[PDB]
Design a protein around this ligand. Structure first.
Ligand SMILES: Cc1cc2nc3c(=O)[nH]c(=O)nc-3n(C[C@H](O)[C@H](O)[C@H](O)COP(=O)(O)OP(=O)(O)OC[C@H]3O[C@@H](n4cnc5c(N)ncnc54)[C@H](O)[C@@H]3O)c2cc1C
Ligand SMILES: O=C(O)c1nc2ccc(C(F)(F)F)cc2nc1NCc1ccc(Cl)cc1
Ligand SMILES: C[C@H](CO)OC[C@@H](C)OC[C@@H](C)O
Length: 450
């Protein structure tokens, strides 16, 4: 148990603040720190911190306490018959994935990096490539133990007597208390592999058409990279990757011996093999166009996790960036296209772009995902950006969509509240379970959730 004044930022490395960071594997010691903050009521409160993968300010508390949860990382049990895992909130999804595979169990929702805690996964109600078929992380929690402001540990379930507080904690960014422990229902699987279909579109219109032609219902997993820099018609052209978990008999004979094995992250990546880039005299001409179309079009390709899910891993080596993520309701297709147009003409160039059609939402009043067009872009920080993303906020807002707290460090409270029309409902729950504001964060203060 060590308390240390530490300078903390999100993954985006901005808006730093200084907090007292408690790092203890001792659960009783955590209960006491919270009991202390509640006693000298009130101060600048406390907030949990997972692995720090949120880009913004949700896991920090300037001039307050921050409880690092990563030492509470015991997997208590895994059961293949019930498909249930019982794990501390500090367990991470990579650790969990590894521990569970031998049981034929699969982490039901995986984000774009496995370095996130169970606590972070719940508090941000994270989504992945399978949202349209599996919903978000919150949908899969069968119980969790929440340390509240009064110093008690409350056992919450999605349909029990504490359902309301359960669903306020899902997506609650740690502002209902500290998730100590949870039970997750896993997805059964017979292999660690995917059967994947790849498609390449020529334009924004094609990308939308492919996601609206009914084909999505044939794949449990689906996401795309899209072009956000090229002028129309090239704007919004996409490499789409869709699939489902493979069964044993679908594997080639070579891989049937160990169907649930995970492959090691290799020493040599593509920057190590080709140091001078991948560009040749063909890349930007018709043969290049033809080559990209071909490599990105395929059917029934067997892929492991890295290949199917982390296709940025092969580009290795390739701070001053602003991550922006929003979703626009399904029906607002024209408005969605408009927003992509605004991005392209902005003079702000993003290369790392995610496109995904979200499925049905859950009952959490602060849950980010709603059915519709989800987009992430990554803008280099340069003159004009701050004021331009505010304009984007305005358009996202008026088009019925919202920003994601896990990605935000700079939107206003007014915008956020308008984007989340159930925020008042949520605030009423939070105020009932934390009258003295024992739990607090830089985000809570910025977005007036405190
Ligand atoms: C490369 C990359 C790819 C990503 N891809 C995706 C994606 O595909 N989908 C997606 O949804 N997100 C994605 N994210 C965002 C990420 O999944 C979330 O920010 C997640 O919350 C990070 O978990 P963490 O353990 O690092 O939590 P932190 O960022 O440390 O904390 C996040 C929030 O969770 C709260 N919290 C953490 N632990 C606890 C606890 N034990 N009890 C109560 N509250 C707690 C904190 O108070 C804070 O509000 C991505 C992030 C990166 C960097
Ligand atoms: O960096 C992030 O914050 C991120 N956010 C994501 C949000 C949603 C999705 C989803 F839509 F696929 F679920 C994937 C994400 N991948 C992410 N990162 C991995 C990645 C993989 C490929 C690309 Cl073209 C760009 C990013
Ligand atoms: C962005 C989305 C999430 O992982 O999938 C990207 C795939 C479809 O494209 C591969 C990239 C590297 O070109």
């Amino acid at each position: 148990a060590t308390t240390t004044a530490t300078r903390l930022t999100g993954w985006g490395r901005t808006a730093p603040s200084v907090a007292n960071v408690l790092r203890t594997p001792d659960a009783e010691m955590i209960v006491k720190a919270v009991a202390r903050v509640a006693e000298s009521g009130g101060g600048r409160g406390a907030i949990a911190r997972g692995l720090g993968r949120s880009y913004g300010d949700n896991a920090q508390n300037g001039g307050g306490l921050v409880i690092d949860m990563t030492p509470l990382n015991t997997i208590h049990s895994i059961d293949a018959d019930t498909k249930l895992v019982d794990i501390d909130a500090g367990v991470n999804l990579d650790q969990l994935m590894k521990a569970a595979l031998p049981f034929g169990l699969w982490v039901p929702v995986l984000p774009g990096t496995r370095q996130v805690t169970v606590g972070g996964a719940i508090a941000c109600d994270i989504h992945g490539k399978n949202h349209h078929s599996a919903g978000s992380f919150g949908n899969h929690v069968r119980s969790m133990d929440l340390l509240t402001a009064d110093g008690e540990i409350r056992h919450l379930t999605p349909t029990g007597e504490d359902a309301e507080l359960f669903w306020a904690t899902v997506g609650g960014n740690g502002l209902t208390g500290i998730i100590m422990r949870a039970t997750i229902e896993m997805t059964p699987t017979s292999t660690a592999y995917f059967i994947a279909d790849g498609d390449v579109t020529a334009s924004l219109d094609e990308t939308i058409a492919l996601h609206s032609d009914g084909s999505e219902a044939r794949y449990t997993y689906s996401s795309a990279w899209f072009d956000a820099i090229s002028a129309p018609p090239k704007l919004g052209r996409a490499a789409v990757s869709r699939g489902r978990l493979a069964t044993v008999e679908q594997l080639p004979a070579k891989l049937r011996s160990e169907p649930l094995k995970f492959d090691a992250p290799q020493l040599l990546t593509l920057p190590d093999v080709f140091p001078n880039g991948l560009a040749n005299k063909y890349t930007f001409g018709p043969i290049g166009e033809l080559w990209y179309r071909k490599s990105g079009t395929y059917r029934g390709k067997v892929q492991n996790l890295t290949q199917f899910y982390h296709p940025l891993d092969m580009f290795g080596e390739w701070a001053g960036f602003l991550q922006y993520q929003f979703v626009i309701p399904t029906e607002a297709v024209d408005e969605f296209k408009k927003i992509i147009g605004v991005i392209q003409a902005s003079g702000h160039y993003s290369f790392l772009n995610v496109f995904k059609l979200f499925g049905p939402r859950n009952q959490a009043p602060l849950s980010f995902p709603i059915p519709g067009w989800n987009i992430c872009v990554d803008f280099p920080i340069k003159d004009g950006l701050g004021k331009f993303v505010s304009e984007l906020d305005r358009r996202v807002l008026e088009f019925g969509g919202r920003l994601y707290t896990a990605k935000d460090s700079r939107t206003t409270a007014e915008t956020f509240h308008a984007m989340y029309p159930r925020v008042d409902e949520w605030i009423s729950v939070r105020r009932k379970v934390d009258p003295l504001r024992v739990f607090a964060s830089d985000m809570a203060r910025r977005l007036e959730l405190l």
